[PDB]
Amino acid sequence: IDPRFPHHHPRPQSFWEARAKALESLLIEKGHLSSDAIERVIKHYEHELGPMNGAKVVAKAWTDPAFKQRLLEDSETVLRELGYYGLQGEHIRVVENTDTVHNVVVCTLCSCYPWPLLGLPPSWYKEPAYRARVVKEPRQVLKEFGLDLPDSVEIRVWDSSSEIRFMVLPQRPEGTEGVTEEELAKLVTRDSMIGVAKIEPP
Amino acid sequence: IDPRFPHHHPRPQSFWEARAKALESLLIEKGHLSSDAIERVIKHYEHELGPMNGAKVVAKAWTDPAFKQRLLEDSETVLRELGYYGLQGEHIRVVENTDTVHNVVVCTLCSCYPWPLLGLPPSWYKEPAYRARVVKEPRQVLKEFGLDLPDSVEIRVWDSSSEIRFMVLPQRPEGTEGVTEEELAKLVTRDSMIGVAKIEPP
Amino acid sequence: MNGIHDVGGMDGFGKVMYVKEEEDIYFTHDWERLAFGLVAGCMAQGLGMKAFDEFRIGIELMRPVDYLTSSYYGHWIATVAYNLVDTGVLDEKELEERTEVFLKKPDTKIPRREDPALVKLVEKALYDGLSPLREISASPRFKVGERIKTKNIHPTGHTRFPRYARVKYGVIDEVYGAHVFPDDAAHRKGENPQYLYRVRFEAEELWGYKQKDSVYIDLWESYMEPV
Amino acid sequence: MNGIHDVGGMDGFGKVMYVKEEEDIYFTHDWERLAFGLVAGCMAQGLGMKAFDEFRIGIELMRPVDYLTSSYYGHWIATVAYNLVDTGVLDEKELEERTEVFLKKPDTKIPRREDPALVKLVEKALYDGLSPLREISASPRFKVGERIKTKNIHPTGHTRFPRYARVKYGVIDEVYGAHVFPDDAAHRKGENPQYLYRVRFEAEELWGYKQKDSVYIDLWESYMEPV
Ligand SMILES: [Cl-]
Ligand SMILES: [Cl-]
Ligand SMILES: [Co+2]
Ligand SMILES: [Co+2]
Ligand SMILES: [Mg+2]
Ligand SMILES: [Mg+2]
Ligand SMILES: [Mg+2]
Ligand SMILES: [Mg+2]
């Protein structure tokens, strides 16, 4: 490495791995962490949480108009009543897609996403391309996802710059007469709750 | 490489080297370039040009007040008369340091620099740290170079956003009574012609 | 800070790498899982970070070349390291030496410890969270429907005021209440809660572009001025 | 383009690596010298680029991770490659295959050719240069001393309008004359010369900062509007 140009040389991924282990090592040796504390976190975010929680909320709003109205009038109270509350999900707002309004959620500054309701964010949600572009050219970005909105549909992009979080409530698709709440939940995609997809009719 | 994350993986320097050779190979095979054409460029920019050209201009302006006045009134005509003209030096302006005005030159968008007069830019001139910072916190940047200006000295930063180029004319230091023009040139540093240093008294 | 992390409105980052959700794996390496456990385990105990403000500024301080190459959970490792050393929880040299140990011998055994009380403590963070909502005695400066102009400010410390939203007219959409103020809290300067607002900006104002697009951004009171 | 290259006013890039001038080597690898010869040798013949506009946009199109890691002359290799393929001088697949040849066998011999006429042609570029000054029949919109406001525009193509200077009041310092217009010329859309101005901006307007600092920036007429 030429010392004029240290900034050209990234840490290799082996470094981040080594540093993670060193942190773990030191913290456990000093009594700040435990093996089971670390495991408990991993279990929670890799397995316990997920987008099925949001799916259940969407399916309930599609089935129960009174619940939908309450959800949109005071989503924080409603969501907490349902138990979908916790770290990075203390203040969750729901934004309703309509025929002429399409909502898309981002965290331009990082990756903020309501873990208690939706689980972990998509890979792409955290990366520069989506974050940079969606605020400026959301129609172009949505076309990459297969969603090509008419010019007459208004797009509202919600940038998660505070600890307030946002879930999209997508519209129920056509062709779902007779489908139960439980079966409707199975139709709700993660991507529809971020605004990068509509729900396909089954 | 995980195909979700191709953008995390930079080209190695071996790639740039290989690509340079492939370009050279193809261009020479197709008759677009020659060995001697490439050498002639290299000779010019590594050996023929350099900051001694600017040094001679500064020393002449320090010695000859009539020349200095002409240089500052119409530097393009003067510099061309002297032969300091060519690619990336078609329109060179000279900006005069004074007791209360200090000039510093940058190319925030890349590395633009008047090769026919000054030769190739410093390593650091082309890199992000200088380019990003000098327009916003020039006093902080100049302190890193050892130049700590009083708050009462005004700083003018010149961003080379067009093909117009800028040389700083630094002030002649004290303690140089009796020193010839030729000897004065030897005192003119490259860095003083960019504005990141004053001239030390000998 | 006007850093690499503040990407909104940038060009050149290319196509979004779409993947079907069922194929979008969370973790491909155990150290990434470990990063999650380190972050939540430390934050649950206020070690190096009391909430997300301190967390974020450690990420934003990364060398740009590292930010773009480390992968996501590398960001998390960087900020844990940064904050634990900054607060005096870990010593820099000890951390470097131990990192060298694991670089040269990756299979070095990790010490094991069970601490069921710590597990319960971590669970409480996970479920009770860290809401930044506070009350203050001052009244909001702005009201719903008011046209504001966002400031020309350039904090060299942490801020939640994205560059693309600076020096813009917008319209107050909601007054949330007073939230812990990131620009101070990230630097351990006090919660200093300030009213937080959601603000709508039109595409024509943001970009000079012509489509029916808008951006809703949450902005603290001090980011804005009346018109 | 609002790209990685447009760094003015950014934070986080760190300390300037000072080196004494006598120690500040120009080239450490022969491929870097070769990059210089490729750029000037092609531009002298209008191959892939007629001037610097086309040159710059090839650099600005680099992947950000490459821009920050390639080293300076890697930028030059990237833009030569880009522009020669874009104009049809080189075929993409042939260039990739040949690049593979040199990756697998770096010591592969380079074909030799002497062309003294080409040498003289290249010398003419070096000494005669490529001045972008033109004349147009229109008169300048702005005058020395006029207060202008720079536009809120976000070209997705090449521009010389740095982000840090957008939506700013400044004062016309000089009317240079009409220069080839980069935003069109970089894309091979015609010289379309426009009046070029030097414009002074004060630190308080640029940053809201309090020192006796200013920035002089050269801006084409279409970047600005009257007040
Ligand atoms: Cl929908
Ligand atoms: Cl001086
Ligand atoms: Co985030
Ligand atoms: Co440049
Ligand atoms: Mg309908
Ligand atoms: Mg928010
Ligand atoms: Mg004096
Ligand atoms: Mg210029």
Side-chain angles (χ1 to χ4, degrees):
Chain A
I1 302 166
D2 181 328
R4 296 175 299 171
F5 311 120
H7 53 103
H8 292 356
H9 298 271
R11 298 293 198 169
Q13 274 193 49
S14 64
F15 172 85
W16 300 114
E17 176 178 54
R19 186 72 123 202
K21 294 180 194 159
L23 294 164
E24 180 184 27
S25 176
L26 287 168
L27 289 166
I28 290 177
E29 283 177 358
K30 302 171 190 296
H32 288 124
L33 286 181
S34 68
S35 310
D36 52 345
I38 290 170
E39 193 79 75
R40 178 69 191 96
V41 175
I42 298 167
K43 181 186 303 186
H44 190 64
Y45 290 101
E46 187 168 11
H47 306 289
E48 298 177 332
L49 296 181
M52 67 288 334
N53 294 154
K56 283 176 189 58
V57 169
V58 169
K60 193 178 176 82
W62 288 349
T63 291
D64 181 346
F67 173 75
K68 179 173 169 178
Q69 186 182 39
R70 291 197 307 281
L71 184 65
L72 298 175
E73 289 169 347
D74 188 2
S75 60
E76 300 193 16
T77 297
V78 173
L79 290 167
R80 190 174 183 187
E81 280 172 2
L82 297 176
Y84 303 128
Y85 183 92
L87 194 68
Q88 289 294 291
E90 301 93 341
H91 300 285
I92 305 174
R93 302 303 192 82
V94 178
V95 295
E96 182 185 15
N97 287 352
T98 64
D99 286 340
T100 69
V101 177
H102 197 78
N103 301 283
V104 184
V105 183
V106 64
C107 183
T108 68
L109 297 171
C110 57
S111 58
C112 310
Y113 191 80
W115 305 330
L117 185 59
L118 298 178
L120 300 187
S123 53
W124 50 259
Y125 180 95
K126 305 177 257 182
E127 298 297 319
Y130 178 72
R131 288 163 54 207
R133 294 172 58 215
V134 73
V135 289
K136 183 173 80 189
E137 52 187 56
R139 296 161 199 277
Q140 298 306 128
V141 169
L142 290 179
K143 276 174 70 177
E144 297 176 12
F145 283 93
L147 182 51
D148 191 9
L149 292 166
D151 292 342
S152 62
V153 170
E154 309 174 25
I155 301 169
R156 297 176 180 180
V157 179
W158 300 74
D159 195 1
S160 301
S161 54
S162 78
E163 306 299 353
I164 303 293
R165 300 278 164 274
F166 306 91
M167 186 191 87
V168 180
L169 171 59
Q171 294 201 261
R172 185 177 177 164
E174 311 300 321
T176 60
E177 297 88 351
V179 176
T180 64
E181 188 178 345
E182 294 72 21
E183 281 303 309
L184 287 168
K186 300 174 178 183
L187 303 184
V188 184
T189 64
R190 174 200 66 184
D191 287 357
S192 74
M193 293 177 291
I194 305 170
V196 301
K198 294 187 169 181
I199 306 297
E200 292 304 307
Chain B
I1 302 166
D2 181 328
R4 296 175 299 171
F5 311 120
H7 53 103
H8 292 356
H9 298 271
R11 298 293 198 169
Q13 274 193 49
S14 64
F15 172 85
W16 300 114
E17 176 178 54
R19 186 72 123 202
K21 294 180 194 159
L23 294 164
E24 180 184 27
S25 176
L26 287 168
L27 289 166
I28 290 177
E29 283 177 358
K30 302 171 190 296
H32 288 124
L33 286 181
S34 68
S35 310
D36 52 345
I38 290 170
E39 193 79 75
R40 178 69 191 96
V41 175
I42 298 167
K43 181 186 303 186
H44 190 64
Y45 290 101
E46 187 168 11
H47 306 289
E48 298 177 332
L49 296 181
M52 67 288 334
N53 294 154
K56 283 176 189 58
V57 169
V58 169
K60 193 178 176 82
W62 288 349
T63 291
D64 181 346
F67 173 75
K68 179 173 169 178
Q69 186 182 39
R70 291 197 307 281
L71 184 65
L72 298 175
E73 289 169 347
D74 188 2
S75 60
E76 300 193 16
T77 297
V78 173
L79 290 167
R80 190 174 183 187
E81 280 172 2
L82 297 176
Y84 303 128
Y85 183 92
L87 194 68
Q88 289 294 291
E90 301 93 341
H91 300 285
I92 305 174
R93 302 303 192 82
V94 178
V95 295
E96 182 185 15
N97 287 352
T98 64
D99 286 340
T100 69
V101 177
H102 197 78
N103 301 283
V104 184
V105 183
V106 64
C107 183
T108 68
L109 297 171
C110 57
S111 58
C112 310
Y113 191 80
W115 305 330
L117 185 59
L118 298 178
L120 300 187
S123 53
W124 50 259
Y125 180 95
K126 305 177 257 182
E127 298 297 319
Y130 178 72
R131 288 163 54 207
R133 294 172 58 215
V134 73
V135 289
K136 183 173 80 189
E137 52 187 56
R139 296 161 199 277
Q140 298 306 128
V141 169
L142 290 179
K143 276 174 70 177
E144 297 176 12
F145 283 93
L147 182 51
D148 191 9
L149 292 166
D151 292 342
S152 62
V153 170
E154 309 174 25
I155 301 169
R156 297 176 180 180
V157 179
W158 300 74
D159 195 1
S160 301
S161 54
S162 78
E163 306 299 353
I164 303 293
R165 300 278 164 274
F166 306 91
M167 186 191 87
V168 180
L169 171 59
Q171 294 201 261
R172 185 177 177 164
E174 311 300 321
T176 60
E177 297 88 351
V179 176
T180 64
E181 188 178 345
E182 294 72 21
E183 281 303 309
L184 287 168
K186 300 174 178 183
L187 303 184
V188 184
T189 64
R190 174 200 66 184
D191 287 357
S192 74
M193 293 177 291
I194 305 170
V196 301
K198 294 187 169 181
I199 306 297
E200 292 304 307
Chain C
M1 62 182 289
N2 290 176
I4 188 56
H5 76 287
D6 180 6
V7 299
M10 287 186 72
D11 301 311
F13 288 109
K15 296 288 195 287
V16 178
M17 296 297 91
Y18 172 87
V19 44
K20 292 184 185 303
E21 53 196 70
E22 68 180 21
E23 296 167 22
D24 201 12
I25 317 302
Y26 295 151
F27 305 100
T28 61
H29 307 268
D30 268 353
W31 68 266
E32 297 177 313
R33 294 179 173 91
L34 175 55
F36 222 117
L38 293 173
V39 170
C42 286
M43 189 182 295
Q45 297 175 90
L47 288 174
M49 56 203 71
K50 306 309 179 188
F52 287 82
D53 305 302
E54 293 154 283
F55 173 88
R56 294 189 185 91
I57 187 54
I59 297 173
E60 299 165 5
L61 291 167
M62 288 177 82
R63 303 193 302 154
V65 69
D66 288 339
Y67 181 86
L68 294 182
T69 62
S70 62
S71 82
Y72 184 70
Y73 293 105
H75 297 356
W76 289 22
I77 297 305
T79 194
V80 168
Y82 170 75
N83 277 294
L84 288 181
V85 168
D86 193 53
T87 61
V89 177
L90 297 178
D91 176 78
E92 177 102 84
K93 180 168 81 80
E94 189 175 32
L95 176 66
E96 217 55 63
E97 313 223 79
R98 191 66 54 90
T99 300
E100 191 61 24
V101 166
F102 282 100
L103 276 175
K104 293 322 298 292
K105 256 57 181 71
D107 48 287
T108 297
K109 288 300 288 206
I110 307 293
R112 310 299 197 198
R113 199 167 75 85
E114 285 189 43
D115 185 344
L118 176 64
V119 174
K120 292 298 195 197
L121 182 167
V122 173
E123 294 181 342
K124 167 178 52 18
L126 302 185
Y127 293 99
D128 285 355
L130 295 169
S131 167
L133 177 57
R134 301 294 181 266
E135 291 183 354
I136 59 179
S137 297
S139 294
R141 189 172 192 202
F142 309 113
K143 70 167 48 172
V144 173
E146 184 170 3
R147 193 179 202 213
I148 60 79
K149 194 179 197 190
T150 73
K151 292 181 181 177
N152 186 221
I153 54 169
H154 294 268
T156 53
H158 182 61
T159 186
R160 299 300 292 183
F161 188 18
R163 288 165 67 199
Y164 76 90
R166 301 194 192 151
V167 198
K168 298 293 178 193
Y169 293 98
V171 174
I172 305 296
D173 207 64
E174 180 169 356
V175 188
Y176 292 105
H179 284 218
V180 171
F181 179 50
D183 303 38
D184 286 356
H187 300 279
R188 313 184 227 276
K189 305 195 194 193
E191 286 189 346
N192 304 159
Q194 289 177 20
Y195 283 107
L196 177 72
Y197 302 85
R198 184 166 62 257
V199 188
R200 173 175 166 135
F201 297 91
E202 306 299 340
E204 180 69 24
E205 177 68 5
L206 293 176
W207 324 109
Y209 288 177
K210 309 296 168 188
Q211 335 84 339
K212 295 181 182 319
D213 303 338
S214 58
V215 187
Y216 289 69
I217 315 177
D218 293 347
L219 299 173
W220 273 266
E221 193 169 274
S222 67
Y223 302 165
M224 298 180 286
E225 59 192 24
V227 179
Chain D
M1 62 182 289
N2 290 176
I4 188 56
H5 76 287
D6 180 6
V7 299
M10 287 186 72
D11 301 311
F13 288 109
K15 296 288 195 287
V16 178
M17 296 297 91
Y18 172 87
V19 44
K20 292 184 185 303
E21 53 196 70
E22 68 180 21
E23 296 167 22
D24 201 12
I25 317 302
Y26 295 151
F27 305 100
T28 61
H29 307 268
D30 268 353
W31 68 266
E32 297 177 313
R33 294 179 173 91
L34 175 55
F36 222 117
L38 293 173
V39 170
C42 286
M43 189 182 295
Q45 297 175 90
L47 288 174
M49 56 203 71
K50 306 309 179 188
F52 287 82
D53 305 302
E54 293 154 283
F55 173 88
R56 294 189 185 91
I57 187 54
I59 297 173
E60 299 165 5
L61 291 167
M62 288 177 82
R63 303 193 302 154
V65 69
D66 288 339
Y67 181 86
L68 294 182
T69 62
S70 62
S71 82
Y72 184 70
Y73 293 105
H75 297 356
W76 289 22
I77 297 305
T79 194
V80 168
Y82 170 75
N83 277 294
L84 288 181
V85 168
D86 193 53
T87 61
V89 177
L90 297 178
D91 176 78
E92 177 102 84
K93 180 168 81 80
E94 189 175 32
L95 176 66
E96 217 55 63
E97 313 223 79
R98 191 66 54 90
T99 300
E100 191 61 24
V101 166
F102 282 100
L103 276 175
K104 293 322 298 292
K105 256 57 181 71
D107 48 287
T108 297
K109 288 300 288 206
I110 307 293
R112 310 299 197 198
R113 199 167 75 85
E114 285 189 43
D115 185 344
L118 176 64
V119 174
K120 292 298 195 197
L121 182 167
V122 173
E123 294 181 342
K124 167 178 52 18
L126 302 185
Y127 293 99
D128 285 355
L130 295 169
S131 167
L133 177 57
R134 301 294 181 266
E135 291 183 354
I136 59 179
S137 297
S139 294
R141 189 172 192 202
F142 309 113
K143 70 167 48 172
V144 173
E146 184 170 3
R147 193 179 202 213
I148 60 79
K149 194 179 197 190
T150 73
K151 292 181 181 177
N152 186 221
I153 54 169
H154 294 268
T156 53
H158 182 61
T159 186
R160 299 300 292 183
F161 188 18
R163 288 165 67 199
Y164 76 90
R166 301 194 192 151
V167 198
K168 298 293 178 193
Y169 293 98
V171 174
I172 305 296
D173 207 64
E174 180 169 356
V175 188
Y176 292 105
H179 284 218
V180 171
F181 179 50
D183 303 38
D184 286 356
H187 300 279
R188 313 184 227 276
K189 305 195 194 193
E191 286 189 346
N192 304 159
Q194 289 177 20
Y195 283 107
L196 177 72
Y197 302 85
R198 184 166 62 257
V199 188
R200 173 175 166 135
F201 297 91
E202 306 299 340
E204 180 69 24
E205 177 68 5
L206 293 176
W207 324 109
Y209 288 177
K210 309 296 168 188
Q211 335 84 339
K212 295 181 182 319
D213 303 338
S214 58
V215 187
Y216 289 69
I217 315 177
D218 293 347
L219 299 173
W220 273 266
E221 193 169 274
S222 67
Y223 302 165
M224 298 180 286
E225 59 192 24
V227 179

